[PDB]
Amino acid sequence: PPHGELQYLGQIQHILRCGVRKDDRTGTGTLSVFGMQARYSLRDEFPLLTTKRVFWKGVLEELLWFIKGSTNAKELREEGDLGPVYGFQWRHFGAEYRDMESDYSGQGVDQLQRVIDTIKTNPDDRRIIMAWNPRDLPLMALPPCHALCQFYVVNSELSCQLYQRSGDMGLGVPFNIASYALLTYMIAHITGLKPGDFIHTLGDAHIYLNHIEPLKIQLQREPRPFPKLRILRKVEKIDDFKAEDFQIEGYNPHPTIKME
Amino acid sequence: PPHGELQYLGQIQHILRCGVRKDDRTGTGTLSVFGMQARYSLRDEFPLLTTKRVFWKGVLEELLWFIKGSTNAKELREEGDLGPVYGFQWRHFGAEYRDMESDYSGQGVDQLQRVIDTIKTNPDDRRIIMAWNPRDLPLMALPPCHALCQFYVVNSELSCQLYQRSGDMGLGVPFNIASYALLTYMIAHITGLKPGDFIHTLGDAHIYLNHIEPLKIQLQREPRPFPKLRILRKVEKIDDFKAEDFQIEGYNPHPTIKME
Numbered sequence A, B: 001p002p003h004g005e006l007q008y009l010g011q012i013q014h015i016l017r018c019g020v021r022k023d024d025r026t027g028t029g030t031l032s033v034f035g036m037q038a039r040y041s042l043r044d045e046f047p048l049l050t051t052k053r054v055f056w057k058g059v060l061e062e063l064l065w066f067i068k069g070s071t072n073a074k075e076l077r078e079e080g081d082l083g084p085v086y087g088f089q090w091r092h093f094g095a096e097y098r099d100m101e102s103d104y105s106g107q108g109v110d111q112l113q114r115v116i117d118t119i120k121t122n123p124d125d126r127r128i129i130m131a132w133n134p135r136d137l138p139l140m141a142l143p144p145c146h147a148l149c150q151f152y153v154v155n156s157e158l159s160c161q162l163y164q165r166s167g168d169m170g171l172g173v174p175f176n177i178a179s180y181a182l183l184t185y186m187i188a189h190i191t192g193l194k195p196g197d198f199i200h201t202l203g204d205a206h207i208y209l210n211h212i213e214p215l216k217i218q219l220q221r222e223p224r225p226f227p228k229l230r231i232l233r234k235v236e237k238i239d240d241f242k243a244e245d246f247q248i249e250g251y252n253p254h255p256t257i258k259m260e
Helices: A005-018 A056-067 A087-091 A111-121 A172-190 A209-218 B005-018 B056-067 B087-091 B111-121 B172-190 B209-218
Strands: A020-023 A029-041 A147-154 A157-168 A194-208 A228-231 A246-249 B020-023 B029-041 B147-154 B157-168 B194-208 B228-231 B246-249
Touching: A005 A029, A005 A172, A005 A194, A005 A209, A029 A209, A029 B029, A029 B147, A029 B157, A029 B194, A056 A087, A056 A172, A087 A111, A111 A147, A111 A172, A147 A172, A147 B029, A147 B194, A157 A172, A157 B029, A172 A194, A172 A228, A194 A209, A194 B029, A194 B147, B005 B029, B005 B172, B005 B194, B005 B209, B029 B209, B056 B087, B056 B172, B087 B111, B111 B147, B111 B172, B147 B172, B157 B172, B172 B194, B172 B228, B194 B209
Parallel strands: A157 A194, B157 B194
Antiparallel strands: A020 A029, A029 A194, A147 A157, A228 A246, B020 B029, B029 B194, B147 B157, B228 B246
């Protein structure tokens, strides 16, 4: 059966051939297509892309920081306090922010624990849903999310669909595919399920004009078999995962590509 | 180029062959697949499905009622007051509900006017986003939406992506495809853009066990060319559209299918 990374390369090729010129926020140029989806199995493999070396260690450490609900940039204005932003929404959505050293237990909606609790109380549930760009929060009332992850459970397999309103294909998409797939493994481990599929849907799927040439070269590379992800200890709670619990194996990517 | 309805029939066939048994809320059985997408052009055609006669008149009238922000079931408990539900979220999200005859102007977020205003102030915007199942609102704090529509503008064409957390393939999906495509035409008309694509993404795409047999027969029918939708007057504001403004033409569907 075809390697799932072929989906990604195919999407790159489509944006190159068929994308239309469109400006971002800063007035920087992209090639853009509206509406795209790909599925990556998580069964006995882990979709760390192989056509370029993906920064696995950084994927892991940023996710653990999000999970912790941190607003202290330094854990990753002067003192490094980011305000009520990032994993603060995953773990304390809607709580009055005081400071990045304050204690927020029982304050706001914990979307993450809520997902895990529903998986356990009603696995059939169609509402197992959990992110905002920080810049958007004070910009308006009811500001639209950046990403929504929906989880789905059947035959003791956990699957995840991540819909992002925009996706930077060269830089963000690979990092995200690994990030939400890692989260899916974490939650599946703690709820006693097996990972199933990861589905990535995007609104404005785009390539920055600058990335066109390195991406053309990336396309001429052939995917190697996806690695495996091995969780090394039995872990009970989401907040208890540690970077040293995860081991990637059989990962043989092509060389790094630096994209602007 | 292949008729877009082939996407739909293909998805039916996939759920039949590959869907897994899964129970809904009421414990009724379905065949389910997680993660699906289809695109339907709106350029010089209107995706009213042709393999069964779709209730066009009802699509139109329910959308106009949603647009009006109504909570009076009778316009479509005793008196017929539904509470703060449906188009009330499209036009007054978050406003304190008093009654279905109260006046809510300037109260809550009007998502709909906000979409139209962004289309006009910044067409490049990646946040042009606007629905909840009524049953979910009081069930929890920060309750997940049922559907999110994202709009996208490029070369003076308006496109729409509707992501639904679950989709009833036999009954709901056709009705929705026509409903969001009609909304896209309405907004494109008022903002001086041309309709582009409608993309439908679903979380739990499912077929009710009861619909299996009529759907098997629907699959053996061949799509006819999509009709056209013609808006018959120049309309200035979204709230000014009337059912008599729309005419469907060249619609020759196969016979009605009644699904439970």
